[PDB]
DNA sequence: ATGCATTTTTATTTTT
């Protein structure tokens, strides 16, 4: 009977739920790329300035 | 990050 509260909460909060998941995946993208760089760039001149 | 092009130093061949 109080279902309007559930729809109101969905309207209000899901903006931040999407923003959080985007932020988490963005951080994970950088972490994984920083690993993958050294995973393949190993012809032996590595300073790692790319990964910095 | 990986590589190529130019400059410099060197040991050897040759001329004087």
């Amino acid at each position: 009977d109080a279902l309007l509260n559930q729809f109101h909460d969905m309207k209000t909060n899901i903006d931040d739920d999407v923003d959080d998941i985007l932020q988490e995946n963005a951080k994970e993208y950088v972490v994984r790329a920083k690993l993958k760089a050294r995973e393949v760039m190993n012809k032996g001149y590595w300073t790692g300035n790319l990964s910095r």
Side-chain angles (χ1 to χ4, degrees):
Chain A
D1 196 19
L3 185 63
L4 293 174
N5 297 350
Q6 184 171 352
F7 281 69
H8 166 68
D9 291 344
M10 289 161 65
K11 181 178 171 177
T12 305
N13 298 322
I14 289 174
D15 307 347
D16 297 344
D17 295 333
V18 178
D19 190 22
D20 284 353
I21 296 166
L22 291 171
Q23 191 173 124
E24 182 158 34
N25 283 266
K27 289 171 178 178
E28 188 179 343
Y29 201 124
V30 173
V31 172
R32 289 187 184 279
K34 282 185 175 187
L35 294 172
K36 194 71 187 182
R38 210 189 200 151
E39 199 180 300
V40 302
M41 302 181 190
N42 58 25
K43 293 188 174 180
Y45 310 72
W46 177 279
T47 72
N49 179 63
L50 174 68
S51 191
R52 304 193 306 228

